[PDB]
Amino acid sequence: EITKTLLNIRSLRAYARELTIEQLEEALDKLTTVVQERKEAEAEE
Amino acid sequence: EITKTLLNIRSLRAYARELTIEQLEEALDKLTTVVQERKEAEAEEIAA
């Protein structure tokens, strides 16, 4: 369910209105972290 | 709901396990673009 939002800019943008630019920057850092840990993980694989 | 998933590294990480790295990179790019559209949306409420 968090998946139809994240993968569609229109919905992501609408949901994003409930967050501040600083919170959005934090969500980005977190998501960046998850993605990177998943790349480090596919390579030792 | 999505706020708590995105704003909490632990919960966000669990959810991500259901996605493919490609789906994950796609998500990261979309969120990056939203963060960019928002910043750029704020320079015009300023200069204007």
UniProtKB/TrEMBL annotation, chain B:
It comes from Vibrio cholerae serotype O1 (strain ATCC 39315 / El Tor Inaba N16961). This is DNA-binding protein. The chain holds residues 5 to 52 of 137 of the full protein. Belongs to the histone-like protein H-NS family. It comes from the Bacteria. It is found in: Cytoplasm, Nucleoid.
